[PDB]
Symmetry: C3
Subunit: 114 residues, 3 copies
Amino acid sequence: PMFIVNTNVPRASVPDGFLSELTQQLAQATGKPPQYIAVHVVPDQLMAFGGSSEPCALCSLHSIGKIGGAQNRSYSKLLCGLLAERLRISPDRVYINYYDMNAANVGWNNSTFA
Amino acid sequence: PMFIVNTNVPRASVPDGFLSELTQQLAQATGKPPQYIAVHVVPDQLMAFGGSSEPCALCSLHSIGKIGGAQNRSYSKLLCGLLAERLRISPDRVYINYYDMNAANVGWNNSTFA
Amino acid sequence: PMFIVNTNVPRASVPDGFLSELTQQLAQATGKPPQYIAVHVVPDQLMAFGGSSEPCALCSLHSIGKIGGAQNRSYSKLLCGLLAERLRISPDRVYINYYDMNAANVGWNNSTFA
Ligand SMILES: O=c1nc(-c2cccnc2)sc2ccccc12
Ligand SMILES: O=c1nc(-c2cccnc2)sc2ccccc12
Ligand SMILES: O=c1nc(-c2cccnc2)sc2ccccc12
Ligand SMILES: O=c1nc(-c2cccnc2)sc2ccccc12
């Protein structure tokens, strides 16, 4: 899986350990091995959410499966929780787009997962 | 809705108020209230379009609905117009990818939409 | 087509000709003229892959067609090869998401390709 967070919160506000925590928490949440989890945090972005430049985040989670109604609610609680606690971003200023990737459309190490 | 523009134009060339204008104009164009609209502008990027490093932009618009043939033509006219007028990017050096998101695949405020 | 690479490799380690090399190689691989190809490289990113911050890349390739099981297996070899040689990234620390875009969902030059 791959999780990306884009935020206007400054780099200095991203705690040491955050990438590791996202990796571990996402491994738990998706049930996929941590070695397959990629995480990408992009601070200091020029962003607005609802016209306001208060802290916000635009995120994506891509996974081959493990994406769906109840699962995505669980991920959103988890991930908004982490963004609120670690980056001090209000959950109502976060969007997370979820993508259920076909294995044939995910490349890795000179092939795909199909 | 979420609009992202990645461009090689420098940050200093992005006019004051650009994210506000994008918010307002996208609210009008999509019919969604501006509170729902998130905008993300990423200048100074290392990019090429057609092998040329002249000003260009790669953009995305994600929305739960309000995506379709005629609508996307209208968004393209609007958005290319703004990138041309405000960032001085030729419309023929802009790609905009449109994504119709299922509500269940959009997280917000500790949960997802439906 | 549009190819994006996000990587923790530093900017100074991205060769000046990489965007052009990618443009040319992707034109050959997709069978699309290079004028249609846009490339975006984002270095210096805060990323981890499998919980490690050794060099890695998260990439996407969007195209109106020319996307599919066999083609994506081929693109992965092409792109892993380029990332390994030019950016010194191990191919097992590369993900590439492939997106077959509907022409109606790709904006360009004030309109879409529909
Ligand atoms: O569910 C998975 N999703 C992966 C993914 C999806 C989209 C983008 N990038 C990566 S990689 C992976 C490797 C092994 C086992 C499961 C997975
Ligand atoms: O106007 C509203 N905006 C909302 C929203 C959703 C996502 C991002 N930003 C804002 S959710 C909402 C709930 C109840 C009543 C009004 C609203
Ligand atoms: O049209 C909407 N799209 C939203 C969206 C889509 C994709 C990514 N991020 C946000 S937020 C929203 C909230 C309530 C009612 C409509 C919408
Ligand atoms: O295959 C193509 N894909 C293009 C694309 C797709 C997704 C995102 N950005 C660009 S642009 C294009 C122009 C003319 C003829 C073919 C194409």
